[PDB]
Every structure is written in C-alpha cells, then in structure tokens.
Design a protein around this nucleic acid. Structure first.
Ligand code: MG
Ligand code: MG
Ligand code: MG
Ligand code: MG
Ligand code: MG
Ligand code: MG
Ligand code: ZN
Lengths: 132, 315, 77, 116, 208
RNA sequence: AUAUACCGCCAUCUUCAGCAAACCCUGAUGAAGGCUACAAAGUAAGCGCAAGUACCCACGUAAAGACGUUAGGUCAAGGUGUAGCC
C-alpha cells in the first residue's frame, strides 16, 4: 500500500481540513502549490537556496506560533517582495498578534534583505471540511 | 434553510453589482457570461479540473435542489401516495397506468364502433428530486414503450413526448474541399494530414501526367521502395484515374512509411473536389477518408516496451 | 395476503406502535392482530367493488358531515 | 400416479419396519435442478475408419481414392460447423425445451410454506 | 487499442463498388451503411486494391519477414518469383514440343497446386488422460491446415540447410519439387499421416 | 542490540468490488442473518473503482485502486522509546 501524505480513511473522528485531504497526485488538478518562484522553470538555477529559505521560514512560522495557525502558509516570492499571507485564529488579544506580526516583519526585512507584509484572515478555527 | 439561501442570494447580487461597477458597464446588461469572463480574467485558476474553477452563479446551482416539506402543522401529508417511500415515481406510474387503460378503452370503442430519444436515469433523478433503482426504471421504460406502440392521438401523444429528448447530429461527413484558383491555378486544391508524426500538404491537379513530386524532386528519388509507391497509387487506383492527375506534395517529418501514409491521407482528403459524394463515401468506407492515430505507446518505467514486462521469473 | 401467500408486515408493525387495523379477512389469513376482523371474500371482481364503495360512502358521512358541527361552535367565536 | 407413504418413514405411529430411509427430509425446495449438459460426443468414427482403410490400401497420395476422403472431410466439416453455429447462436428451440430460468422464476413465484 | 468498437473492416475489392446497382438487397445494405458512416479503420501499409497481386502471396511475405524488415522480405519474394520464372522459361525453351505445349508458365497456379498438395488432412493432439500423452486424430479447418502447411514449408526452407546452400534458388527448387508430388514437405505429411493411422485406435478418447 | 516500540517511504494479493456511524425485524431477545421489481424487511451518510485528470476526443495509455495477511523491507532518507559508555 503506497501510504503517502493522504489522510487515512478509518473512523469518523478526525477533523480533516481541505488542503492535505486530497491525494498527492491531484496537485495539478484539485489542489495547488504553497510556494511559487522562478527557480522551478527551465533555464533557472539557485533553487536549493530558495528551498532552504522556504523550509526555514516554515519552521520559524510554526515555532513562533505554537497553535495560532490553522493549516499552512502560501508563499509568494515576487522577486524581492516576500509575503507570508496566511490566516489567524480568534483566541488571543489583538495586541499580541500585532506585536508578533511586527516582530516577524522586522526580522524578515533585517535578515533576509526583503520587506514582508502580512494579510491576516479572520477565521474561528481550523477550516474543517470533513469530520471523517 | 431559507434564510441562508436569501443570504447567499443577496451576497451574489451585491457581488454582481460590485463587479459591474468595477468593470464599467451597466448592471442590467451585465450578463452571466460577462460575469464568468470577468471572474476568469481577475482570478486566473490554472488547473486541469473543470470543477475547481471560480464560479459566481445563482445559489440554485451551487446548492442542490433541497427536498421540500410535504407535511404541515396538522401532520397530514400534502401528497396522496406519501406513506410508501417514493411519491412522485408512484404518482407517475399511476398516471401512466390510467393513460394506458384510457387508451385501451378508446381502442375498444373504436373497434366496436366501426430524431428523439427517451430519458436517462441520471437526467430523471436530476430533474425530479427522487432516487430509484434499475429494474423499476426498466419497467417504466417498458410501460412507456407499450404506451407508444398503442393507438395514440393528441393528449397521450404530447404526454409521452414530454418525457422525450432530442439526439445530436449523426452525419459525420467531412467538408467538401472547394476549388481554389491562385494566380492562373486551374484544378488547384490543397489539403493537410497528420498520422504517426508526419505532416503532408498535397497539391492535386487535374491537368498533368501521372507523376508524384515530393519537395520539388520526383517521388522516385525520395521513395526507392515500391511500398510507398503502392501506398500512393492506391488512392488514384480506387478512382480509376492515373495518367490524368498530377500531384506535388511537400511532406516533412517522420520516416518513409509515415510520410507515405501522410501523403496518401492528404491525397484522399484533397480528391474530394472534382467528383461526386458517392465516390468519396465509397473511399471513406474502404479506408481513405479517416485518420490513423496509431502513435507510439508511452513506455512505462518497469516494462520492456509499453507492454512486455522485464525479467519476472518464478523461483 | 399479497402475491406470495404470506401475512403482510404492516399488520404486524401496526400492533407494535399501538395502531389499530381494520382488515378484511377471508379464509386463509391470520385474523389475530386485527382489532376488527370480518369474514368475507376478497377475490371476486364484483365483490371487491362493494367493499371499496362502502368505504367511500363512509368518508361521505365522516369528513363531509364535519361541517354540521363546525357551525355549532362558530356561533360564539 | 404417486405411491403413498403410509408405512414408509420411521415415525412414532408405524408398528413395522421402515422401507424407505432417505438422507434428506421429504420437503421440496423452491428451485429446479440444472439440466444435464457438457458430455462427450466423439462422433464420426466409421468415416474416419474407412478413410484410414482407403489410405492404407492405396499409396499415401490422395489421388487414387479421393472420393472417400473428400466425403469424410465434407461430413466432418458440416457436423463441426453445424454444432458450432447451433451452440453459439441458438439455445431456445420451439415449444417445450431447455427452460430453467422461467422454471425457477415460477417456482419462486409460488414457493412452499413448511412453517405453517 | 487505439480503435473503438462497432467499427468495420477496410475493404479491398473495387469492381464490386464500381457499379453496385445490381439488385435491391445489397443496395439497401450499402445505403444503410453509408447513412450513418461510422469511423472506418485506415488501410495498413501492406494491402493494395491492385489486380497484379494475391492475398496468399502477401500473407506468405508477411510471415517470411523476421522482426522488422519489410524490404528484405519483399526483395526475397521478388527474387524467388523471378527465379521460378527463369527456371520455368529455361525448362520450356530446352525441351521438344509436346512438353512445351502441355505445360504452362504461370507460377501462381504452380504455387497454388503446391500449397494444395502439401496441405495436411488430419492432426494429432497430445491428450493428457491419466498421466500419459496419447495422440488422437481430430478434424481441422481449411485455414488452419493451410497455415500449418505454410509454416512447415517455411521451417523446412529455413532450418534444413548446410553451408553451401543459398535461399532464393533453394526455395525455388523446394517449390518445384513440391509441385511434382515428390518433396520433403510431402514426405513429412506422409509420415504424419502414417503415424496418425498407426494410432487410429484412440478416437474414443475425444470429447468433442 | 531490538522495524516483537514507531512516525515516514513501499511490496504479490489489487487481471474485481466490499467494508464502516444511526434504526427495525427474525433467530422464544444464544452466538448470527436480513438476497426474491409478476418482489416475503430493508433505508444507509463515507471510503476505493466505475463516475473523474492529462496525452492522439467518447478508443487506448498514464496517474490512482479502502478497512488487512506476510510481527513483510528498512531504527541503515530522516528523528524519537529501552539497554552500556565519554
Ligand atoms: Mg503502486
Ligand atoms: Mg440424512
Ligand atoms: Mg525487525
Ligand atoms: Mg471511477
Ligand atoms: Mg492507483
Ligand atoms: Mg528484517
Ligand atoms: Zn390476501
């Protein structure tokens, strides 16, 4: 059994979302891509550095928000304008959210030589699609 | 339930208003096709699935046809045949049985006083909010057939035609190539052709001898094997016209047999200009006016040649 | 009895949910769960038209007769 | 006519010896048995025998006695083609033949009620 | 594979369709066929509506080709045909008069007669009953016996060879010997026939 | 050192279609079963194929094909439990 990143169908009790709920072969059909940059085309290079930066940013966003995030994060590498557009939960005070957003933007702009602006989305919790 | 539907409808209409305002046209003339075009232009979804497309239609298409309530505050259902699972299906069965017995009575009285297709189970269950099986559907189709075979008239005729449809086109005849004149070009015609990765453009004439030119030079220097010569002679032989038709094709890409078949197909499709339609039908039914999509099969990462496996033994 | 010669399940489930059943038992049925049985033929063509019409006349004297008592209570309000 | 079984089965009211001792109870079911089919034929033997005889009589060439071998081949081909065409395209027949489907359908339409 | 169902076979004959106005049955048939005009398959690169060929010759040429060498098989067939033609003409011009007048020079009739003579009549099958293989004579159709004779001739012309022998003149001599009712393929046919006759007491083991 | 602690990546079965939440009936309410369209108690959210995506369309090909047997292959993509050591 080719057990991939798809959700196993067993008992109806796992609040699975919509992102990783689909099969890994429906990416170019019923899904999409979290990251997007010019390194994924013919004739371009420096893709290893882009992948390292992407995985480091993902780890940093997952560590700085222990549960404040819902699913994942969409990457938009517009040459020299990174945008970590994601969502936010309605559980903490807005002051803490503003503080964390400002700290992350300052760290990004002063470390990766790139300004970052966020676009938070008001959701109650995890975007659940099936209770299976 | 109705409150959420009204919320969706008001959201849809305010979104349509905003879209007609941002596009620059009048909201009354802002049809649904323009809505879809604007959504596709503003939200370019580059996927392969046709269901994952950004749509903004009426909530009647997004939400399925909800089953209405048949009982009121008193508890008595609104339909007569409700305490049996299926209501509309059994009502239609009773109606068609009544029509059948009416037709039988009318036929008995007459004896004493002396393009389209049927419905589909999927279409039926999508039109009527009701689920059925296959045996009952076959029985209903047989009852409809018995209704049609009987002596119909006007009322029963329109009643059985309301449960009909309309088939699409069935004449798959190709377009007849007209006669083109390009600078003193009498009996001039061109065609194309694509088979086994080979593109040919034959130029059939009706005023020369009996030779074939491939890329300027004759076909003898380009087709040394008699196989291609016979393949190109077959179309001219099927019409009994050899020494009165000259061609000059410019084929490119593919091997000898692929280019020969491409030129043959081009000649067959170009000869449909100075002959009747019965001859081109005879040529099509014999194997000329048809495509040959025999392309090389995609090799699999584990098989020898897209069919045979590797070296799988038993011990 | 249906088309297999076997007692139907509706008469068995009626006594389960405390629901009476007025059936027409002939001579090969099980008139035990029926609260109001009556021996009578139910296979002749001209016979079944009698019971079906008597049940129709009972409606014309039950729901149609309801209007005779609706005017008595509507005099006050 | 069917013979009666008054003192056949060993019951409590039979002061004698049982003559019929079946394995399964004498209660019929609601299905009919399958018709007999798939048997060995091996027809056309005398023709092959006389063909081998006329081959051994003359030389190995079939020019001295071609009529016998020709008739044998014709009969064999006719029989084979007839059997194949029949078993491929026709299985009904006329009035009264191989009828198992409708038979079991009628048996299920009027089954047996052994549980009173 | 790459062809859907309910499709017909590409026709080869032309004179039958040059004037199909004989009677009414075939007229209605061809009219109903051309009405819906289904997607007829394309003609392969081996069939031709010419009258200077023969389907048996084409089948033999296709069977002779090993792997993917159509030009090689075609050249070998042309060489065999020209060799038998030259041999016929040499034995015609080097004779008397009665022999020259009582024989023909058409190689097609000679090849057809050789095929009809080398065609077997009975076949044996190794029926495994109880653990032993016993040969039982069973009837065979015409096409199967023709294919068996063709393959026997092919394998005799191929396998049976030494070192100094050739191939075109070898096959020509083999066909000329098979036409004269004295050939190795006819010898193998007679051996198979006598072997089947020696075991004729096993026809009762067949079940069809 | 243990895949007889895993997460993770896969295998013949898989060249098909069956399995799991909520009810009722029959087995005197025992383990269990619930198939008869000229129909005697079956309704079934969900899963996998069919339905669907792409290539040469509706053919064909590719991608996929559940709940598990093999304590199946691997602590030896990569990291974590238990033993002994700096
Ligand atoms: Mg796999
Ligand atoms: Mg017994
Ligand atoms: Mg282990
Ligand atoms: Mg499917
Ligand atoms: Mg798969
Ligand atoms: Mg191991
Ligand atoms: Zn009854």
């Amino acid at each position: 059994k080719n057990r991939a990143a798809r959700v196993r169908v067993s008992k109806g009790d796992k609040p699975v979302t919509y992102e990783e709920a689909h099969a890994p072969h429906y990416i170019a059909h019923r899904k999409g891509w979290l990251s997007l940059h010019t390194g994924n085309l013919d004739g371009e290079d420096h893709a290893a550095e882009r992948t390292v930066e992407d995985v480091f940013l993902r780890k940093f966003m997952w560590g700085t928000f222990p549960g404040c995030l819902a699913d994942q994060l969409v990457l938009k590498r517009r040459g020299n304008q990174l945008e970590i557009c994601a969502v936010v939960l309605r559980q903490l005070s807005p002051h803490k959210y503003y503080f964390l957003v400002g700290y992350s933007e300052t760290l990004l702009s002063y470390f990766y030589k790139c300004p970052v602006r966020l676009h938070l989305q008001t959701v109650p919790s995890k975007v659940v699609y099936k209770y299976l | 339930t109705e409150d959420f539907i009204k919320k969706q409808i008001e959201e849809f209409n305010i979104g349509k208003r905003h879209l007609a305002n941002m596009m620059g046209e009048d909201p009354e003339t802002f049809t649904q096709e323009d809505i879809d075009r604007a959504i596709a232009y503003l939200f370019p979804s580059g996927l392969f699935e046709k269901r994952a497309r950004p749509v903004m239609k009426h909530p009647e298409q997004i939400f399925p046809r909800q089953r209405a309530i048949q009982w009121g505050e008193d508890g008595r259902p609104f339909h007569y045949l409700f305490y049996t699972g299926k209501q509309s299906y059994y009502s239609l069965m009773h109606d068609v049985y009544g029509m059948l017995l009416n037709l039988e009575k009318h036929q008995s009285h007459l004896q004493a006083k002396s393009g389209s297709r049927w419905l589909i189970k999927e279409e039926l269950e999508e039109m009527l909010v009701e689920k059925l099986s296959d045996l009952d559907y076959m029985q209903f189709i047989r009852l409809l057939e018995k209704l049609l075979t009987s002596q119909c008239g006007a009322a029963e005729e329109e009643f059985v035609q309301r449960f009909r449809r309309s088939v699409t086109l069935e004449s798959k005849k190709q377009l007849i190539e007209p006669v083109q004149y390009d600078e003193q070009g009498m009996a001039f015609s061109k065609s194309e052709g694509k088979r086994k990765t080979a593109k040919a453009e034959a130029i059939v004439y009706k005023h020369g001898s009996g030779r074939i030119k491939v890329n300027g030079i004759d076909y003898q220097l380009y087709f040394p094997i008699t196989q291609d010569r016979e393949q190109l002679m077959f179309p001219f032989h099927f019409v009994d016209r050899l020494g009165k038709h000259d061609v000059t094709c410019t084929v490119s890409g593919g091997g000898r047999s692929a280019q020969a078949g491409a030129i043959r197909l081009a000649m067959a499709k170009a000869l449909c200009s100075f002959v009747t339609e019965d001859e081109v039908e005879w040529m099509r039914q014999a194997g000329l006016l048809t495509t040959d999509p025999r392309v090389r099969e995609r090799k699999k990462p584990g098989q020898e040649g897209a069919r045979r496996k590797f070296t799988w033994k038993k011990r | 009895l249906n088309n297999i010669f076997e007692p139907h399940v509706a008469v068995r489930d009626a006594a389960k949910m405390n629901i009476p059943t007025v059936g027409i038992v002939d001579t090969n049925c099980n008139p035990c769960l029926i609260t109001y049985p009556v021996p009578g033929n139910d296979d002749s063509p001209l016979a079944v038209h009698l019971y079906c019409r008597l049940f129709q006349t009972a409606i014309t004297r039950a729901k149609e007769k309801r209007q005779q008592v609706e005017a008595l209570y509507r005099l006050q309000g | 006519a069917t013979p009666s079984l008054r003192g056949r089965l060993a019951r409590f009211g039979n002061p004698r010896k049982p003559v019929l001792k079946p394995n399964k109870p004498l209660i019929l079911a609601n299905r009919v048995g399958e018709r007999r089919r798939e048997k060995g034929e091996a027809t056309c033997i005398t023709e092959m025998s006389v063909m081998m005889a006329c081959w051994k009589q003359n030389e190995f060439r079939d020019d001295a006695c071609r009529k016998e071998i020709q008739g044998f081949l014709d009969c064999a081909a006719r029989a084979q083609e007839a059997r194949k065409m029949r078993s491929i395209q026709e299985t009904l027949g006329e009035s009264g033949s191989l009828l198992p489907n409708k038979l079991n359908k009628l048996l299920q339409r009027f089954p047996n009620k052994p549980y009173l | 594979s790459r062809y859907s169902p309910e499709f017909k076979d590409p026709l080869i004959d032309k004179e039958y369709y040059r004037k199909p106005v004989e009677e009414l049955t075939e007229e209605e048939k061809y009219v109903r066929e051309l009405k819906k005009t289904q997607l007829i398959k394309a003609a392969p690169a081996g069939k031709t509506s010419s009258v200077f060929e023969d389907p048996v010759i084409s089948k033999f040429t296709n069977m002779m080709m090993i792997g993917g060498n159509k030009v090689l098989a075609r050249s070998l067939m042309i060489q065999t045909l020209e060799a038998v033609k030259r041999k016929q003409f040499e034995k015609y011009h080097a004779a008397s008069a009665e022999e020259q007048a009582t024989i023909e020079r058409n190689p097609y009739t000679i090849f057809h007669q050789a095929l009809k003579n080398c065609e077997p009549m009975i076949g044996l099958v190794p029926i495994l009953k109880g653990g032993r293989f016993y040969q039982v004579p069973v009837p065979l159709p015409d096409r199967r016996r023709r294919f068996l004779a063709m393959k026997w001739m092919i394998t005799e012309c191929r396998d049976k060879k030494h070192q100094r022998t050739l191939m075109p003149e070898k096959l020509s001599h083999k066909l000329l010997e098979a036409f004269h009712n004295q050939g190795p393929v006819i010898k193998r046919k007679h051996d198979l026939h006598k072997m089947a006759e020696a075991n004729r007491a096993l026809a009762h083991y067949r079940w069809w």
